[PDB]
């Protein structure tokens, strides 16, 4: 894992001091579900792993 584990969206439409913006809000929300889902499930595998040991 690293920030590039999910679609690492920064910034938002409009005037910024950065050079990046987020994408379609609905997909950005879906992306964060993916981010949270991906890590929790990886923890679940490690969780399950602990029980194996």
């Amino acid at each position: 894992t690293m920030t590039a584990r999910s679609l690492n969206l920064k910034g938002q439409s409009g005037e910024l001091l950065s050079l990046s913006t987020a994408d379609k809000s609905n997909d950005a929300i879906g992306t964060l579900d993916a981010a949270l889902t991906r890590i929790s499930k990886q923890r679940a595998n490690l969780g399950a792993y602990f029980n194996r040991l």
Partner: protein, 53 residues
């Protein structure tokens, strides 16, 4: 020596048995997990996590 042979057999049998305690505890854990899996509102994504275990 025959008494010894009888006793060496006991150790083989106990060793074998210990591996069976491990194996049966595993089935009981699989059964617990199978019951959760058999829940028709328990999702396919979550079933994958169980199948990891």
């Amino acid at each position: 020596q025959a008494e010894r042979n009888t006793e060496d057999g006991m150790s083989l049998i106990q060793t074998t048995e210990g591996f069976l305690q491990e194996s049966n505890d595993i089935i009981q854990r699989i059964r617990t997990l199978a019951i959760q899996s058999s829940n028709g509102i328990y999702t396919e994504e979550d079933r994958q996590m169980i199948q990891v275990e």
